[PDB]
């Protein structure tokens, strides 16, 4: 690995610099290197890993959506033939997106999840597994689409089961998981009613637990609750 000769602590420090610089591909490469040292990640380090890859895949998802839209219009009646280039370039971006998702899934499988025993780490990694299978599902069109969807579902469900047993309903990881699983239901699984029910239940259970929280925790939780509400508004 290109990062094999760099100290763990140096990789972490450079990931933080890359974040400040908005160099997210570098940030991801540093954090991959840090994971590949083989030690478990701290809470802060897990967050750095997530931020890095979320930003990398987010640029790719935004690009893919623009290209897919252009390709779809090219396939309408009365659209002039322009050759293979739009499909080719959409495919290029898609393949790179798939490669990033595969990289993340590979880190989780080798060996982040298997060593994650505390709820906070295990749920966070299983949520990430669901997320990156969801990003794969957003572009999937072939024979394995059902299996990709199934993999996302399974990871999210495992995470949900742990989070309900082990975390308060206000925990930001639990909230963000439920938020993303609701988006999966709505956008991927053709289950808008399930999406809406999960968002409602999650929001209400969190509301009932806010009284237990410090001011700072309250802010963290209410931030994610607001996203649940925003989606409910969009969906109902």
């Amino acid at each position: 690995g290109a990062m094999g000769s760099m100290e763990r602590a140096s990789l972490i420090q450079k990931a933080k610099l890359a974040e400040q610089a908005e160099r997210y591909e570098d940030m991801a490469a540093f954090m991959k290197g840090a994971v590949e040292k083989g030690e478990e990640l701290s809470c802060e380090e897990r967050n750095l890993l997530s931020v890095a890859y979320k930003n990398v895949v987010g640029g790719q998802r935004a690009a893919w959506r623009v290209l897919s839209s252009i390709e779809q219009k090219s396939n309408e009646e009365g659209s002039e033939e322009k050759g293979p280039e739009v499909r080719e370039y959409r495919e290029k971006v898609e393949t790179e997106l798939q490669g990033v998702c595969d990289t993340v899934l590979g880190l989780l499988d080798s060996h982040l999840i298997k060593e994650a025993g505390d709820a906070e780490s295990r749920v966070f990694y299983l949520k990430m597994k669901g997320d990156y299978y969801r990003y794969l599902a957003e572009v999937a069109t072939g024979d394995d689409k059902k299996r990709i969807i199934d993999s996302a579902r399974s990871a999210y469900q495992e995470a949900m089961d742990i989070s309900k047993k082990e975390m308060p309903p206000t925990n930001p990881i639990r909230l963000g998981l439920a938020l993303n699983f609701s988006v999966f239901h709505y956008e991927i699984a053709n289950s808008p009613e399930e999406a809406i029910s999960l968002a409602k239940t999650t929001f209400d259970e969190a509301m009932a637990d806010l009284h237990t929280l410090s001011e700072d925790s309250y802010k963290d939780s209410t931030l994610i609750m607001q996203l649940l509400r925003d989606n409910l508004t969009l969906w109902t």
Partner: peptide, 10 residues
Amino acid sequence: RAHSSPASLQ
């Protein structure tokens, strides 16, 4: 179109 979670959670 929907909002998904921020990357950083604690």
